[PDB]
Design a protein around this ligand. Structure first.
Ligand code: CTN
Ligand code: CTN
Lengths: 207, 206
């Protein structure tokens, strides 16, 4: 049985980085599935309509698919992970191979919302950061990498990302076993999580 | 070598004591526990009324010198005579309890993360989080059930001292935390995580 780690947290909280650093520390032994790339394929709709969608509401996510893949890896099967194109606002034509592994990291802003996802997790983590600090990174990433305007980001954040976060994301902190501050730069928490996983991996091999 | 030093702070009644004991219990006879809440400055010379007015949530109320001395001695592989605080009498007791050195040292208390000098000694800084309302429930059940406190007394001490000093001194130390731990009283996962970190540090020292 693969050690399942659930990593949730607000947008730009450091959960992507934390997840990757943990993935990098265990090498070939981890499969990382970012739920933030599993938005429903709305490619058949005009840009005007893909731009109105609230991408922070659980309904914007293809939970069916995400869970299908989470369960495939749990049975030692690989998946063709979809890739969301954040610049064009649609499911990209690009796919990415994710091989099964003894450690599966389920990372995303809402990976702790559906009970179906929680039941698959051995360790549930919430990466904590104050919205002001997170907004700074959100804005930077959006203007530098996603073709987003200054006004567009503020608008999106205030009428969507934020209220959705307070109402959906943030409450899932109650389901967390451990809370990680400064997810992006916390070598101590990283080591402890690696150690936790290393111990479980040892239980897999040892008998 | 050098012992693994874990700091466990949090508000009053957050679970910091139970988590500290659970971790100590699990690691067996390989841990030394120093509850800073038993290191209040000895004030037995003062009259009871004076002792009842002291703000026991302010930094100046703690004998950090003694605490730091005991922390340094334990790190140098030396046992210590830990003072025992009497909460019913509101004064340090004349008798102390011995605490032997160990490969794992736990420094637990509401303000263990406040002094810059205590943090420097810590390898892993932990903060047990629990909402103020919930913490107040337990703090209130305990004070009346085992500390001879009146219902009115607990409320006055909380609103006038415990709460203000928490927002001002305690809560902010959460910024120094390497990891935050919710439900410190019954969190098996977080315990196996903390234990996992300790065992690896024990592996590194011998
Ligand atoms: N087309 C999309 C889809 C998602 N997002 C933002 O991504 C965050 C989760 O990664 C969510 O916080 C969401 O706001 C976005 O800007 N545009
Ligand atoms: N004589 C004393 C001394 C301290 N305390 C309370 O103990 C808590 C720290 O465990 C602190 O929260 C502090 O208020 C107490 O109730 N009575």
């Amino acid at each position: 049985k693969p050690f399942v780690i659930g990593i949730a947290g607000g947008t730009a909280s450091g959960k992507t980085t934390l997840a990757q650093a943990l993935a990098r520390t265990l090498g070939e032994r981890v499969a990382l599935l970012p739920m933030d790339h599993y938005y429903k394929d709305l490619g058949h709709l005009p840009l005007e309509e893909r731009l109105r969608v609230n991408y922070d509401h659980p309904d914007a996510f293809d939970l069916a698919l995400y869970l299908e893949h989470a369960q495939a890896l749990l049975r030692g099967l690989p998946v063709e992970m979809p890739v969301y194109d954040f610049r064009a606002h649609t499911r990209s034509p690009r796919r990415t191979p994710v091989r099964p592994a003894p450690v599966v990291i389920l990372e995303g802003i809402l990976v702790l919302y559906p009970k179906e996802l929680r039941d698959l997790m051995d360790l549930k983590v919430f990466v904590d950061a104050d919205a002001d600090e997170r907004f700074i990174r959100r804005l930077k990433r959006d203007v530098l990498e996603r073709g987003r305007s200054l006004e567009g980001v503020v608008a999106q954040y205030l009428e969507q990302v934020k209220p959705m976060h307070l109402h959906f994301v943030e409450p899932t902190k109650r389901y967390a076993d451990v809370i990680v501050p400064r997810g992006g730069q916390n070598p101590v928490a990283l080591e402890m999580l690696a150690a936790k996983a290393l111990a479980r991996l040892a239980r897999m091999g040892a008998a």
